[PDB]
């Protein structure tokens, strides 16, 4: 998955990972990545996008990223 | 193996009704509303229908039910069942549609 392909296309990348954002009864997030090619791709300069960087930091195999520079009232009812 | 058999094996995927042209149902305008006498040992005057169909070609159609109301310039829906009692005719007029509707008290 480079910049060219879409989300669901056939990709040379092996895994975005075993992933399940749905909460599951306790320890609510999923099991994380399978491994050993994730470090190769992030080593090779393949970029992460914003939330995979948050998820990789949150799993603690990478350090986390601070998101907010300022606060203005976000609307939670947009959905 | 034997190389003649190796070259011995897409044909014509033949529609066994060649007037519906692979489709199940084609409409059309009835050219003539007429009856005929059938092959022995049948002798009841069966009522038929020559229809100028959707595909621009013509074939005869069996008229079912206790009478009907079809005249000249009349649209029908033609189905794919044949009537055996006269040769060469393969079409059935389904009832529950257009100017040919259902009979009274069926």
């Amino acid at each position: 998955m480079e910049k060219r392909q879409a989300r669901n296309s056939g990709v040379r990348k092996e895994d975005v990972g075993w992933w399940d954002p749905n909460p599951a009864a306790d320890g609510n997030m999923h099991l994380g990545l399978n491994f050993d090619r994730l470090k190769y791709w992030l080593t090779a300069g393949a970029k992460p996008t914003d939330k995979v960087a948050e998820l990789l930091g949150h799993a603690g195999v990478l350090p986390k990223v601070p998101q907010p520079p300022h606060y203005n009232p976000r609307d939670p009812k947009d959905d | 193996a034997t190389v003649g058999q190796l070259l011995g094996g897409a044909k014509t995927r033949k529609c066994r009704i060649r007037q519906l042209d692979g489709s199940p149902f084609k409409k059309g305008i009835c050219l003539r509303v007429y009856t005929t006498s059938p092959k022995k040992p049948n002798s009841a005057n069966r009522k038929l229908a020559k229809v100028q169909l959707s595909n621009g070609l013509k074939a005869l159609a069996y008229i079912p039910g206790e009478g009907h109301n079809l005249q000249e310039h009349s649209m029908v829906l033609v189905s794919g069942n044949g009537v055996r009692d006269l040769p060469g005719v393969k079409l059935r007029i389904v009832r529950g549609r257009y100017d040919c509707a259902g009979v009274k008290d069926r």
Partner: protein
């Protein structure tokens, strides 16, 4: 790497080579033999028709010349007429000289004696080759004596 017979050399610095490659067909479970033709660069034009050559991929030189000749394995022996007349001279010289030296011993008896002793010298030679290779042993198998 292909090892395939030449069929054409009428052609500048380039020989047309045919190779017997066998393709599978899945329908009848039978390997069908086809032969495809390739155009290949040679450099010395030492390939007479009937030579068994080794072609290999190199840089493409043309639209359709794509391999290069590596080595000619078995040379095709060719018709030289003057050398053929020389073999006529040597061969009937050998026949007439042998019949004159031989010619009671009808000449068949002498030649068949020479072929018998030649075969005997051969059999003694390859038997001693087997003797030096194996030692004193029954000719049961060499696979037994490979231990």
């Amino acid at each position: 790497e292909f090892i395939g017979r030449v069929v054409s050399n009428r052609m500048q610095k380039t020989v047309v080579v045919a190779v017997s490659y066998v393709v599978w067909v899945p329908k009848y479970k039978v390997y069908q033999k086809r032969v495809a033709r390739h155009k290949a660069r040679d450099e010395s034009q030492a390939s007479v028709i009937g030579d068994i050559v080794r072609i290999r991929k190199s840089r493409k030189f043309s639209r359709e010349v794509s391999y290069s000749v590596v080595d000619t394995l078995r040379k095709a022996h060719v018709y030289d007429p003057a050398a053929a007349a020389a073999l006529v001279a040597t061969r009937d010289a050998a026949r007439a000289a042998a019949a004159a030296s031989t010619g009671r011993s009808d000449p068949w008896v002498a030649e068949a004696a020479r072929r018998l002793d030649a075969s005997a010298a051969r059999l003694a030679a390859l038997r001693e080759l087997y003797e030096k290779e194996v030692g004193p042993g029954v000719p049961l198998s060499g696979a037994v004596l490979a231990v």
